[PDB]
Design a protein around this ligand. Structure first.
Ligand SMILES: Oc1ccc(Cn2cnc(F)c2)c2cccnc12
Length: 127
């Protein structure tokens, strides 16, 4: 039930990078998803104390949220787009893992994933 430390958004011994794809992930992809009607559950780490999910972090061992992702992008925390895309997939996957099909929260994630996949279907080309 106690909340774990949120995932890092900076790390001095991790190399940082800025790429055109990563810029697009923040400017277009993340900030578009953010505004979706179903984004609000995924805009911050899950507060298992607030939401009364004392088993959340007993089940999910790689939490991830769009708020974390947003900070990581603004901080150049990622090396490449694929690293950032993998965080999105972790966030959707966590939601399917902790829940079951048909749940309102899963329908939310399912929709966001389709928009996400639509937006990353075509990324800009590297410079
Ligand atoms: O990422 C999440 C954020 C919030 C909640 C609580 N909650 C909010 N709205 C519904 F419908 C549920 C989650 C519940 C299960 C899995 N993930 C969750």
């Amino acid at each position: 039930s106690m909340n774990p430390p949120p995932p890092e958004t900076s790390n001095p011994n991790k190399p940082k990078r800025q790429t055109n794809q990563l810029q697009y992930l923040l400017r277009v992809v993340l900030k578009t998803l953010w505004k979706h009607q179903f984004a609000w559950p995924f805009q911050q780490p899950v507060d298992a104390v607030k939401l009364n999910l004392p088993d959340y972090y007993k089940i999910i061992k790689t939490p991830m949220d769009m708020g974390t992702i947003k900070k990581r992008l603004e901080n150049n925390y990622y090396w490449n787009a694929q690293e950032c895309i993998q965080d999105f997939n972790t966030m959707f996957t966590n939601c399917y893992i902790y829940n079951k099909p048909g749940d309102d929260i899963v329908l939310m994630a399912e929709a966001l994933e389709k928009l996400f996949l639509q937006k990353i279907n075509e990324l800009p080309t590297e410079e």
